[PDB]
Amino acid sequence: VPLDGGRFATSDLNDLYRRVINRNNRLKRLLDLAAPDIIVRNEKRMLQEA
Amino acid sequence: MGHIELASPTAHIWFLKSLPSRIGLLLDMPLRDIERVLYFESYVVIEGGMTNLERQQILTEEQYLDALEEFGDEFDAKMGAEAIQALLKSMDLEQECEQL
Amino acid sequence: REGEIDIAKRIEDGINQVQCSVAEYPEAITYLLEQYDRVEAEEARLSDLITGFVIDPELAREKFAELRAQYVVTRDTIKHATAQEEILKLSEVFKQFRLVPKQFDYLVNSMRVMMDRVRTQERLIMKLCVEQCKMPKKNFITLFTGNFNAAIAMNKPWSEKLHDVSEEVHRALQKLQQIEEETGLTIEQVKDINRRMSIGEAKARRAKKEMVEANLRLVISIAKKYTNRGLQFLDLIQEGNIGLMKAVDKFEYRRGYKFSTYATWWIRQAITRSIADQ
RNA sequence: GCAGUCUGA
DNA sequence: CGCCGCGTCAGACTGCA
DNA sequence: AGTCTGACGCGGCG
User: Which residue of C lies nearest to A42 if distances are taken between CA atoms?
Assistant: First the structure.
């Protein structure tokens, strides 16, 4: 819901979902760039944690 | 509703961490090692093949590289939720229950 | 940068190892003898087929005639160190080919899929045995390093249980024999050479994983300066790292440069373009 | 929408 | 040793994405 | 991830 001050009142899910959608998207980068394993490991673990 | 196509598989935390762990109880593999697998702190061989590696055996980081030198590609091990998904999809339900 | 040289020499050792291991396949000779003739018929080009040797197409003609003459003497060495001296001679001329990346990639994934060809059988037979036999598997290792074409009567009660699957086992022997004859080589030798190339690539990747932590300094320092372009530090480090990875496989380490001094030429390429994308 | 505090029965 | 719970209702006021 | 953090509870239970 948009608030009076302009800063929207947000449920936490819209952040948590956002927190997922970044990292998954980020992972979608590395599967295309053929990144090394030591990087995509950290990225997959961050995705799982999110 | 919507859906996000996860770029990689991902373990559901409700079946992994709610005690008793359903994932662990189904795989007969203790929870403390499954956490190490699907958080990329260890490996697990999805198949040993012609190699002295049990299908539930966990390996640490350098042991995977070491077991490479000893057996090459005879066995196959992964880490993360892909490995647990493989171990799950690989098992035979009715055969396992008739054996147990 | 002496650690860089220690790493790079083991890298080149691994790539020499995978080169001489893939060189043992005789059908690769037929493949390249088709390839060079596609080039000579103006339907292919050598600059996409071979980068150099260990450029002129006449020396390539000489080398490919040598490889053809070596393939015929590979044919007549049916006799088993008699084949071993010839296959070492074939590796001698094969290791003199600085093949184009994509062609060598085709070769190595061809070896991978032909290894998988026997892999499927070696797996499925095991999943047929391990369900019902409770078998002397520790000795199935020996039984399969040998090759059920002779082993039926294993003189135990489970020697009856193998009769439940024996038909599918013999079907698996038929498929194993057809794949064994298709390659013109013993399956065990293929297992060994594929193990060898796997170990070469594993050692190279090992040294790569030491190198990436060895060279975090340059990417950290460049990303720390590039923070202010409208991005976080934590993804500019990714751009610099993947740029470093692109710099790895194309670094002529004998040039005397520090490898870091090379990666920036692509790190700037990797970050300033990524800021364009995000 | 939530948190914190105070208060009432 | 980690995890699960620890009364109901109401009013007021701040502060905050 | 550095905090110039907290913890500053208990009781039962698997």
Answer: C238
Gap between the Cα atoms of C11 and C34, Å rounded: 30
Experimental determination technique? cryo-EM
CATH number of C1-42+55-278: 1.10.601.10
Half-sphere exposure of C46 (CA within 13 A, CB side): 19
Q: Domain coordinates of chain C in residue numbers?
A: 1-42+55-278
* Resolution, expressed in angstroms to one decimal: 3.2
Question: For residue C277, with 0-12 CB atoms within 10 Å meaning exposed, 13-18 middle and 19 or more buried, which class applies?
Answer: exposed
Is the link from the previous residue into B20 a cis peptide, with omega within 30 of 0?
yes
C187, C195, C209: best mutation site toward chain B, by most B Cβ within 10 Å?
A: C195
CA of B37 to C1' of F9 (A): 34
Under an 8 A CB cutoff, do A33 and C242 touch?
yes
SS3 B30: coil
**Of B49, B65, B72, which is closest to C206 when you measure between CB atoms?**
B65
SS3 for chain C, per residue? CHHHHHHHHHHHHHHHHHHHHHCCCCHHHHHHHHHHHHHHCCCCCHHHCEEEECCCHHHHHHHHHHHHHHHHHHHHCCCCHHHHHHHHHHHHHHCCEEECHHHHHHHHHHHHHHHHHHHHHHHHHHHHHCCCCCCCHHHHHHHHHHCCCCCCCCCCCHHHHHHHCHHHHHHHHHHHHHHHHHHCCCHHHHHHHHHHHHHHHHHHHHHHHHHHHHCHHHHHHHHHHHHHHCCCHHHHHHHHHHHHHHHHHCCCHHHCCCHHHHHHHHHHHHHHHHHHHC
Chain C residues with CB under 8 Å of A29 CB are: 238
Closest nucleotide to B18's CA, by C1' atom?
E3
CB atoms within 10 A of CB B36: 16
User: Got the DSSP string for B31-91?
Assistant: HHHHHHHHTTSSEEEEE-SSSS--TT-EE-HHHHHHHHHHHTTSSEEE-SHHHHHHHHHHS
Taking an 8 Å cut-off on Cβ atoms, the answer to whether B80 and A20 are in contact is no
**B73–C198 CB contact, under 8 Å:** yes
Query: Looking at the partner chain, which of A31, A42, A49 has a beta carbon nearest the beta carbon of B7?
Result: A31
